[PDB]
Amino acid sequence: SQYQVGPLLGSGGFGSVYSGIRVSDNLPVAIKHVEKDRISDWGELPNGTRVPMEVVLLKKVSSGFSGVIRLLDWFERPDSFVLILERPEPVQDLFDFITERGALQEELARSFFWQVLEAVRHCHNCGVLHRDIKDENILIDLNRGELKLIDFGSGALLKDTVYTDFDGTRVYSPPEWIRYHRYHGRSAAVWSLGILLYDMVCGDIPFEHDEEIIRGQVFFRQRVSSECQHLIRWCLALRPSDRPTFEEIQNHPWMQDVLLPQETAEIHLH
Ligand SMILES: COc1ccc2c(c1CN1CCNCC1)O/C(=C\c1c[nH]c3cnccc13)C2=O
DSSP: OOEEEEEEEEEOSSEEEEEEEETTTOOEEEEEEEEGGGOOOEEEOTTOOEEEHHHHHHHHHOSSSOSBOOEEEEEEOSSEEEEEEEOOSSEEEHHHHHHHHOSOOHHHHHHHHHHHHHHHHHHHHTTEEOOOOSGGGEEEETTTTEEEEOOOTTOEEOOSSOBOOOOSOGGGSOHHHHHHSOBOHHHHHHHHHHHHHHHHHHSSOSOOSHHHHHHOOOOOSSOOOHHHHHHHHHHTOSSGGGSOOHHHHHTSGGGSSOOOHHHHIIIIIO
């Protein structure tokens, strides 16, 4: 009615995502159907309405501009919720991008990683923990060179105490989760960021099995500068408290002289 539904973009047990167009202005959107009986975590709006937590989280971060995909609207159905999400065009997710082009040049990896950090910082500042940071949940606006974080379906309100639930991606999950089913938000995020950064510069993730994660030894399969290797190994410290803060990551020498998004697009995407 209010949207022209296009092709399916992806699906899972959570539900399904379609490309779409808002009739009123031809604005590109994504349409996410979320099955009610597969929602683990429910939240509340002021009005008291139960909604998926993702709706709560998205509202907390969809204020203003950011590298987070914005929730434009949402609807309730008898057995599902429907989320209307911002859709840049043309886009490609980071997983497909790395698949097509292999390991990224460090200058490009630096630009992308920096934008992800800024997006994650925005989330934390808004009281939101994403909990599933990975290449598939990152969209690249190919024209503007801007990255967007998506899928807060595994996320949670940020807190300073321990989390005992996790339904994000295992190979991006920290050793303390694998072992003790316990983690703290920021340090677990930093671990996933380490996995992400390795993924960008090596063209694949560093760990496949639980035992490799808890061993935490990083082998580099591509030529990577010593500074980048150092940042990666720091983010992947076995002890959570040994991991850097976001500020320490962004002040790391490897992170200096980041390209602007449009510069990034001009050199690397055009
Ligand atoms: C299994 O597929 C899923 C699952 C969850 C979400 C999702 C997709 C579809 N793609 C996403 C990219 N990686 C491959 C799978 O998309 C989302 C949000 C979106 C907001 N705006 C957009 C624009 N284009 C595509 C997507 C979205 C989601 O939460």
